[PDB]
Amino acid sequence: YTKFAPPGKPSLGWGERTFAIVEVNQAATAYNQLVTKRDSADVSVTWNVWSGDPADKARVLLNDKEFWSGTGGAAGSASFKVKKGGRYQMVVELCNADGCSQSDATEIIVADTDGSHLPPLDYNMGEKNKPFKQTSGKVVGAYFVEWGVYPRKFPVDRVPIPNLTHLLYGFIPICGGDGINDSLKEIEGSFQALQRSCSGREDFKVSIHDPWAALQKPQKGLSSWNEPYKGNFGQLMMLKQAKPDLKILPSIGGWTLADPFFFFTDETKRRRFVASVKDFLQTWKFFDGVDIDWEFPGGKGANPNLGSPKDGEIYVLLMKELREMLNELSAETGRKYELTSAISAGWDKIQVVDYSAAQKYMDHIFFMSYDFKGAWSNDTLGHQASLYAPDWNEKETYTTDFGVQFLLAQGVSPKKIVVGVAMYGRGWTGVHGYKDNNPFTGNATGPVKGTWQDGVVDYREIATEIAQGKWEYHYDKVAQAPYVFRPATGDLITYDDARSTIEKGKYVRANKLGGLFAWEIDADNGDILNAMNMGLGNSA
Ligand SMILES: COC(=O)c1[nH]cc(-c2c[nH]c3cc(Cl)c(Cl)cc23)c1-c1c[nH]c2ccc(Cl)cc12
Ligand SMILES: *[C@@H]1O[C@H](CO)[C@@H](O[C@@H]2O[C@H](CO)[C@@H](O)[C@H](O)[C@H]2NC(C)=O)[C@H](O)[C@H]1NC(C)=O
Ligand SMILES: *[C@@H]1O[C@H](CO)[C@@H](O)[C@H](O)[C@H]1NC(C)=O
C-alpha cells in the first residue's frame, strides 16, 4: 500500500498542430511577401482537468523533454518557442505534492527548411541510370534547372541522387530592373517574372525567379494544401534527409542573370548582395553554400555592353567576402559551407581573373568546358566540348585540355578544377560545301531543330534518334568527341557521349583533377552520368 494521489489526467484541447519556423505564403508572388524567416516557431497548447487543483504545477514536454513550465492545475494554457524543426510528441504534465499526471501524447509538426519535419526523398532509378557508390573522392556534380518541372517534367525526385556528390540549383536571380537585368529580356516572360518576384525588394539582393516552381507547386509527397514547403525547395529538403552528404548548392547568375555582377565595383552593392546571401542561406537551410556563376568577368557574356578588366579584382573580392560571410555563418550554425563557381573554359576569359588569388576561398571551380561552338555562328563549326583539338585544326584553343592547362598555368590547384560534361548537343542545319568528307569544314544555313530551343538537343533525344537510325554517328578519336550528321539535310550535332565522358574522367584522374559536372541533369537518359561515375572510378 502507498500514499499516491497524483492529479487527474489532463485532456488536451483541439488546436493547431502544424507550425513553421520559416513561414511561407502559398499564395504570394513577390519574395518579400513569400517567405518570413524567424529563429523559432510559437507552439501553443491548452489542457483541461475537470475539478483539478489550480495550484498544481504544469509542464509541456516535447519528446519527453521540457519546453514550458508554469502553473495551471484545472484548465490551463501555454505558449512557448521551438527552435529546431521536427515531428514532436506533445504531452502536458500536471504535478502536486504526491506525483505527476501525463496527457495523452498529440503529434505536432514544426516545419523548418532543413527538412527536419519531412521524410527522406523517395526515389527509384529510372531509364538507363545504374546505381553507384561515391568512393572515388571526386566531385560528381550536375545542374538542376528550376524551370525543368514544366514541359520537361523533371522534378527533383527524378534526380539519380546516389550518383551525385553535388547538385547545383539553377538559377537564383539577383534583383534588378532595366539596366540591371537586361539579358533576361531575351527570354520571353523572364524579365517580367523577376520584376514580380522582386516587387518592393532592394536591387542587388538575391531572390527567387519563379516562386511557384520553387515553393508552391505540388510535387510527389508534398501535395497537401497546408504543406509549408512544396515545389523544388521542399523536394530538395527531402533530398537532404535522404542523402545528408550530398551538397546542394544554389547557383546565382548564369547566362541571362549575370548582368548585376558587373555593378559590384561598388562595394555598397557588393555588401548588400553578400548580406542577402547570408539571409538566404539562413532562410533555406538545405543549401550547403554558394555557387557563383558570373558569365563573365570582363564581359563577352549575354550583355555586349557590360565588362571591364577590373572585373577580375571584383571577382576575387567577392569570393573573399563570401567566404568571410560563410565563416561567420559557420560560427552560428556550426556547419561547414562550400564556395564554388562556374567559370568560362576559354583562355580569353580565364586571363581576366587571377584565380590563384581567388582559389583560397573556394572549394571547387566548375570548369565550363562546353559551349565552345554552336549555332550562334554559321561559319565556325567545330566540337562543342571536346577534350583535345581535332586533326583539321590542331591549333584550336577552345578545348577542355587547352583551357584546363591554361588555368593550371595560373597556379590553380588541380583538385579544385571540375571538368564540364554536356548532357546536350549543339547543332546546325544545312551544312554544305565541306571537303574531305568532314562536315565541320563547311558552313551552316541555321540552327538544327532542337528539343526546347533552337540549336540545342537533349542527349536523351540524340540517343533515341541514333537507335532509330536517324543519324550517322561519328566519333573523332583525336579530339575525343562524338557527333551525328545527316548528309541529305546537312544536320550536324556536337555533343558528349558515354565515350567522350569516360575519356574526360580519364583525363581528370590522370591530371589529379577535382572531378566532373554536367549541364543539365534533365537532358540525360542515364548514359552520361553513368559514364561520369565510371570515368571517375566510382563503384557499381
Ligand atoms: C548553356 O547556358 C549558357 O548560356 C552557357 N553556359 C555555359 C556556357 C559556356 C561554357 N563554357 C564556355 C566557354 C566559353 Cl570560352 C564561353 Cl564564351 C562560354 C562557355 C554558355 C554559353 C556561352 N555562349 C552561349 C551562347 C548561347 C547559349 Cl544558349 C549559351 C552560351
Ligand atoms: C545563318 O545563315 C542564314 C542564311 O543562310 C541567315 O539567315 C538569314 O538572315 C536573316 C536572319 O533572320 C534573314 O532575314 C534571312 O531571311 C535569312 N535567310 C534564311 C536563313 O532564311 C542566318 O541569319 C545565319 N545565322 C547567323 C547567326 O549568322
Ligand atoms: C563560310 O563562310 C566564310 C565566311 O568568311 C567563308 O570564308 C567560307 O569559305 C564559307 N564556307 C564555304 C564552304 O563556302
CA gap 79, 180 in Å, rounded:
46
Q: Is the CB of 368 under 6 A from ligand 1?
A: yes
- Grid cell at residue 424: 546536350
Residue 424 Cα to ligand 1 midpoint, Å, equals 12
Residue 432 Cα to ligand 2 midpoint, Å, equals 15
| The dihedral sign for the CA sequence 152, 249, 230, 177 | negative
CA gap 197, 149 in Å, rounded:
19
Ligand nearest to the CA of 377: 2
Residue 394 Cα to ligand 2 midpoint, Å, equals 29
Expressed as residue numbers, the domain containing 85 is 11-111
121 CB-near residues (< 8 Å, 6+ apart): 156, 157, 161, 221, 235, 238, 239, 241, 242, 243
CA gap 147, 522 in Å, rounded:
11
Q: Whose CA is nearest to atom 24 of ligand 1?
A: 371
Q: Whose CA is nearest to atom 18 of ligand 2?
A: 445
Pocket of ligand 2 (CB under 6 A): 378, 445-446
| The dihedral sign for the CA sequence 334, 236, 344, 303 | negative
Ligand 1 pocket mutation, candidates 257, 295, 400, 417, criterion most atoms within 8 A of CB? 295
Residue 484 Cα to ligand 3 midpoint, Å, equals 22
What letter would DSSP give residue 316?
H
Residues 216, 26 contacting (CB under 8 angstroms):
yes
Residues 140, 164 contacting (CB under 8 angstroms):
yes
Q: Is the CB of 371 under 6 A from ligand 1?
A: yes
Ligand 1 pocket mutation, candidates 147, 368, 371, 400, criterion most atoms within 8 A of CB? 371
What is the number of other CB atoms lying within 10 angstroms of the CB of residue 372? Answer: 25
Residue 372 Cα to ligand 3 midpoint, Å, equals 19
Q: Is the CB of 481 under 6 A from ligand 1?
A: no
Q: Whose CA is nearest to atom 12 of ligand 1?
A: 344
SS3 of 264-299: the string is: CCCHHHHHHHHHHHHHHHHHCCCCCEEEEECCCCCC
CA gap 243, 233 in Å, rounded:
15
Which ranges in 419-537 belong to alpha helices (H)?
459-467, 498-510, 527-536
CA gap 254, 61 in Å, rounded:
48
CA gap 113, 85 in Å, rounded:
8
Angle at 203 between CA 202 and CA 209, to 5 degrees: 100
Q: Whose CA is nearest to atom 9 of ligand 1?
A: 371
Residues paired with 102 in a beta bridge: 93
CA gap 162, 529 in Å, rounded:
11
One-letter amino acid at 98 equals D
From residue 330, alpha-carbon distances to 36, 111, 323, 324, 366 in Å are 22, 22, 10, 10, 23
Angle at 331 between CA 326 and CA 334, to 5 degrees: 95
What letter would DSSP give residue 153?
-
Q: Whose CA is nearest to atom 20 of ligand 1?
A: 371
Residue 23 Cα to ligand 3 midpoint, Å, equals 59
Going by C-alpha positions, the residue among 399, 329, 113 that lies closest to residue 238 is: 113
What is the phi-psi region of residue 180: left when phi exceeds 0, alpha when psi lies from -120 to 50, beta otherwise?
alpha
DSSP-derived secondary structure for 431-444? -B---TT-GGGSB-
Q: Is the CB of 443 under 6 A from ligand 3?
A: yes
Asked whether the bond before 520 is cis by omega within 30 degrees of 0, the reply is: yes
CA gap 61, 67 in Å, rounded:
6
What is the number of other CB atoms lying within 10 angstroms of the CB of residue 133? Answer: 11
Give the total residue count for the chain. Answer: 540
| The dihedral sign for the CA sequence 138, 416, 158, 525 | negative
Residue labelled with grid coordinates 500514499: 3
From residue 331, alpha-carbon distances to 326, 356, 500 in Å are 9, 26, 43
Buried b (16+ CB within 10 A) or exposed e, 147-157: bbbeebebbbb
CA gap 144, 234 in Å, rounded:
14
CA gap 243, 161 in Å, rounded:
8
What is the number of other CB atoms lying within 10 angstroms of the CB of residue 310? Answer: 13
Residues 294, 257 contacting (CB under 8 angstroms):
no
Residue 429 φ/ψ, nearest 5 degrees: -125, 160
E strand or H helix at 69, and its extent? strand 65-71
CA gap 102, 9 in Å, rounded:
6
Å resolution of this model? 2.4
Residues 459, 495 contacting (CB under 8 angstroms):
yes
CA gap 29, 214 in Å, rounded:
11
Residues 38, 21 contacting (CB under 8 angstroms):
yes
CA gap 485, 480 in Å, rounded:
16
CA gap 149, 155 in Å, rounded:
5
- Grid cell at residue 160: 539519380
Residues 209, 195 contacting (CB under 8 angstroms):
no
102 CB-near residues (< 8 Å, 6+ apart): 9, 10, 91, 92, 93
One-letter amino acid at 529 equals L
Residue labelled with grid coordinates 558552313: 443
CA gap 164, 144 in Å, rounded:
12
Residue 492 Cα to ligand 2 midpoint, Å, equals 17
Residues 444, 378 contacting (CB under 8 angstroms):
yes
Residues 350, 302 contacting (CB under 8 angstroms):
no
What letter would DSSP give residue 375?
T
CA gap 483, 475 in Å, rounded:
6
CA gap 510, 512 in Å, rounded:
6
Going by C-alpha positions, the residue among 194, 195, 224 that lies closest to residue 210 is: 194
Atom of ligand 2 nearest to the CA of 430: 5
SS3 143: strand
Residues 231, 219 contacting (CB under 8 angstroms):
yes
- Grid cell at residue 404: 584546363
One-letter amino acid at 165 equals T
Q: Is the CB of 370 under 6 A from ligand 1?
A: yes
Q: Is the CB of 345 under 6 A from ligand 1?
A: yes
SS3 36: strand
Question: Annotated catalytic sites, by residue?
Answer: 295
Q: Is the CB of 433 under 6 A from ligand 3?
A: yes
- Grid cell at residue 85: 524543426
CA gap 432, 440 in Å, rounded:
9
CA gap 385, 368 in Å, rounded:
9
CA gap 28, 34 in Å, rounded:
5
What letter would DSSP give residue 127?
T
Residue 312 φ/ψ, nearest 5 degrees: -65, -40
CA 370 to chain centre: 19
Question: Torsion angle of alpha carbons 110, 111, 112, 115, nearest 10°?
Answer: 110
Residue 78 Cα to ligand 1 midpoint, Å, equals 57
CA gap 366, 403 in Å, rounded:
12
CATH of the domain at 29: 2.60.40.10
Q: Whose CA is nearest to atom 23 of ligand 1?
A: 371
What is the phi-psi region of residue 479: left when phi exceeds 0, alpha when psi lies from -120 to 50, beta otherwise?
alpha
Residues 111, 21 contacting (CB under 8 angstroms):
yes
Strand 481-486 and strand 472-476: pairing? antiparallel
Q: Beta-strand (E) ranges in 166-270? A: 166-172, 247-253
Residue labelled with grid coordinates 502559398: 26
Ligand nearest to the CA of 302: 1
Residues 404, 416 contacting (CB under 8 angstroms):
no
Residues 23, 40 contacting (CB under 8 angstroms):
no
CA 512 to chain centre: 26
Asked whether the bond before 171 is cis by omega within 30 degrees of 0, the reply is: yes
Ligand 2 pocket mutation, candidates 373, 376, 377, 378, criterion most atoms within 8 A of CB? 378
Q: Is the CB of 436 under 6 A from ligand 3?
A: no
Residue labelled with grid coordinates 499564395: 27
Task: Measure the N-to-C terminal CA separation of the chain; round to a whole number of Å.
Answer: 66
What is the number of other CB atoms lying within 10 angstroms of the CB of residue 70? Answer: 12
CA gap 293, 343 in Å, rounded:
7
| The dihedral sign for the CA sequence 408, 413, 415, 420 | negative
SS3 420: strand
Residue 270 φ/ψ, nearest 5 degrees: -65, -40
Atom of ligand 1 nearest to the CA of 403: 15
Going by C-alpha positions, the residue among 361, 345, 340, 266 that lies closest to residue 310 is: 266
Residue 310 Cα to ligand 2 midpoint, Å, equals 36
Residues 209, 197 contacting (CB under 8 angstroms):
yes
Ligand 3 pocket mutation, candidates 377, 435, 437, 443, criterion most atoms within 8 A of CB? 443
Ligand 2 pocket mutation, candidates 379, 381, 445, criterion most atoms within 8 A of CB? 445
Helices (H) and strands (E) in the chain, counts: 12, 25
One-letter amino acid at 10 equals P
